[PDB]
């Protein structure tokens, strides 16, 4: 087509979605991790994760307001990944890289899994 | 902080939100324009428009599944703007610029209003 494009549009949309998350506006699901609860928007979770995409496209699960993750999932690893989903920023540190990579593998967040694999390989 | 950032994350999220819109997945509102109906996600509309932000933060309106726009609003102008919200691409043409700018002013989409004003000024 002959469209023009606003370069900062996608980033501004994500920034606004994160502001709604902060203020708990229109959040429609609670993700439960080892008794730690995280409120979020189903569509953002689906847009970022192959696991949430599969969960919320399921005819029965799409209607759930609570999702319980596998007990092996670390709440801090999940929190870091939830923050990444809403900001594009990943708080990756020596002390959390193993939990973050394991959580990203479970959530099916391929780009995060890739950078964790590379950062781990650099330290060996 | 000491975060790393995935450059294409915001764009990939918006692309996935547009794929959900195409497949009518988790859309939670119908926008009615001169008897033309558009299905969308309330959070994306809020993230892009000052008008939808005000509508869906209202305690009564946040719960509506149908929103009727002012009858002076042109459905094609709205369609072009809805496409922009989900893609960052604006199909701006000599034949639609007046309807697009009027719709962007009503929806409170300041960056769109700005480029329409500039494109109109160039033709005078």
């Amino acid at each position: 087509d002959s469209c023009i494009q606003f370069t900062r549009h996608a980033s501004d949309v994500l920034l606004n979605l994160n502001r709604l998350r902060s203020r708990d506006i229109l959040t429609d699901v609670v993700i439960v991790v080892s008794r730690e609860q995280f409120r979020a928007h189903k569509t953002v979770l689906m847009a970022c994760s192959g696991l949430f995409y599969s969960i919320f496209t399921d005819q029965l699960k799409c209607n759930l307001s609570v999702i319980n993750l596998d007990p092996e999932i670390n709440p801090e690893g999940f929190c870091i990944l939830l923050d990444f989903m809403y900001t594009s920023r990943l708080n990756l540190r020596e002390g959390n890289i193993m939990a973050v990579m394991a959580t990203a593998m479970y959530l099916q967040m391929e780009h995060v899994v890739d950078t964790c694999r590379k950062f781990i390989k650099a330290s060996e | 902080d000491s975060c790393i950032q995935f450059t294409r994350h915001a764009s990939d999220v918006l692309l996935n939100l547009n794929r959900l819109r195409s497949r009518d997945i988790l859309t939670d509102v119908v926008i009615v324009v001169s008897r033309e109906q558009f299905r969308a996600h309330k959070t994306v509309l809020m993230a892009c428009s000052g008008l939808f932000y005000s509508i869906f933060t209202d305690q009564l309106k946040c719960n509506l599944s149908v929103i009727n726009l002012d009858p002076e609003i042109n459905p094609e102008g709205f369609c072009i703007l809805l496409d922009f919200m989900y893609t960052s691409r604006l199909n701006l043409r000599e034949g639609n610029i007046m309807a697009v700018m009027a719709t962007a002013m009503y929806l409170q989409m300041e960056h769109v209003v700005d480029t329409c004003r500039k494109f109109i000024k160039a033709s005078e």
Binding site: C3, I4, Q5, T7 | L90
Partner: peptide, 4 residues
């Protein structure tokens, strides 16, 4: 704004 840019030409994509």
């Amino acid at each position: 704004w840019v030409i994509p």
